[PDB]
Amino acid sequence: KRVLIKPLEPLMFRSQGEFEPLITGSHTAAQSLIIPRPSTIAGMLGYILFNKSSGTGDWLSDLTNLLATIYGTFIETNGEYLFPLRMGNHLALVDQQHLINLPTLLEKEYERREKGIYELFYDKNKLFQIINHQDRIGISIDKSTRTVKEHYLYSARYLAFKKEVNYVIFIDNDAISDKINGKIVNFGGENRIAKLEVDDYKVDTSIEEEYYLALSPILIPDEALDNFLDNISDYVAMGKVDKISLGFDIANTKRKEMLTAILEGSIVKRSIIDFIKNEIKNDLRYRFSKYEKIGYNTLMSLCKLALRKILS
Template identity: 30%
Template sequence: MSFQTTYSLVIRPLYLASFRWGGSFTPLVTGPAAIAFSEPLPMPSTIAGLLAGEASGYKPFQSKVSPEELGRLIAEKLDFGDKFVLRGPYIYNSDTKTVYLHYWDRSPTRERLVAVELVEGKMVITFQNVDYHQHTGIALNNTCKSVVRGLIYTQMLVKQDKSIIVEVHDAKKAWPDKKIVRRFGGEGRIAVIEKMGDTPLHKLTTSIKVGNTWYAYVATPILLPPHSINNLAKILEGEDRVIDVEEPPNTRILIPTLKELENLIEVEEEQNGSHAGGNTRDKQAKIAKRFRTKIALLSPGYDMAANMPRPLHPAIMPGSIVKIETSLSPQQLYQEGVGLYRRLGWGTLLPLPQKLIVKQK
């Protein structure tokens, strides 16, 4: 007799981490451009690669491996079964019971996380800064081990003092009850991995009661089919607002207008818990702009066998708030995910209530 189990994998990077969403970074680039910022969280492909490594015994793949094949490998070799799905990653502070979600921004100097809490039955979001450590390196000549002139580079590594969480839903077999140490993320930095019985982000979704159309925060990128790029052109030009994500069936994404986002958001001053004074409408408009749908081209990971990034996909990036039309409940769609490769964590959505409180510092 088989059964499904749900739990979380807790990943704790040892002090510093490097998650390079933009692709490979090389010291061969010189000058002001020779700097790279780590994102606060890894892509779902990094998590899938970690699990696939466990499944394969860390033996190198001899040919290209698609994300679908990675899913099948994890299902078979780790005995997760065909029904398993991953949700996240996200950050969790077990002391304060706070969930932190990724907020993707083209500017490296702005806040890159949002803290999500339930306060007196209301969902409250606060923008959070990320602590960085400046790491400077040089390029060496492989033959004589001397410094190559001019090849100096800087990376901003993220200081990660909280746990990265990946939820595993409907797995046939549970993760072993022991800690393991593995290389994780860019530069193969070290992390400790163990199992936790709690699923904090999933618990947040159980408080949401909505109808067939509702808003959601994009927690991990929603990968769209390559052919959808033609439709995205109309969306970017304001001619259309509907994206057919194909997976799961009968589910569509609507790009909300700025006015709709303003009506969803209620701004609150963090100092005293009072509602924002002054021109409230202007503050709502300013905050609403930060949650507008962000679309980019994204590679769903690096193919180690081919030694190259996987082909680019249009993607709705974390930090976007989108409108959902679906026959599924918010809890069902959270577990299902949206878009391509959703069983591996892509397209994780946090359903939102009819009013979202955003605290301002």
């Protein structure tokens, strides 16, 4: 039911693309996401569960045939759980006990709101006690001069883990356990390695509250984008909205689609569930249903570890 992904060494999940030497008189550089996107985690299990007799040009019609349904990802150090929390470009790894009073916090008076929010991302933010940015710098050597090439230098801020950390997901499938278990995986990045571990864990499947946490990017179907962005306060209480690419598919070596999403760790109001349903058309509902299977539209209650969905 529950899958722990144990990184054996610093990882890198880069966004923003174009990490390779193209321009002559210039270095390259890449950062890393603190939490891997669900496309990354889906592609990892899809890599284990791969049979050539499938797909032929799909990468999600092909992917959704392998895994049943994945739920969003968070952190687990020592049996504690930490969850992404996002603000106006600030990201924090906050503990479960601090999300309870967010809806009352986001509604307080001006000065009492800022103080409460400020202390969440600075004092009660447990990210930097758990994760450090190891800014590795690499180099390409030409065997002719046996020195560095013309500006073939790159900086890659890896994801160093000060403590023991796992990424936590849940799968609807149970025939999946004895397949992806104890497996050494090439957890997406610069050829890095993590270990997989499956154990049972009972959590809710569907709930109703007035404020959810986005435990995974909530994809916006690019057709409601106008009727959604013009009135954003009706849907997102706090967090970050931006255009993201869904990744890079292996079987075709192509960058996946690029569509606006609500980044994981945002606080979405209940108004976001019905809005999506009443804006997504069945032309794409069959598509966005798959996007949910790999783990994108995953919501969490600020109460407790209860995992909802949007189209499900």
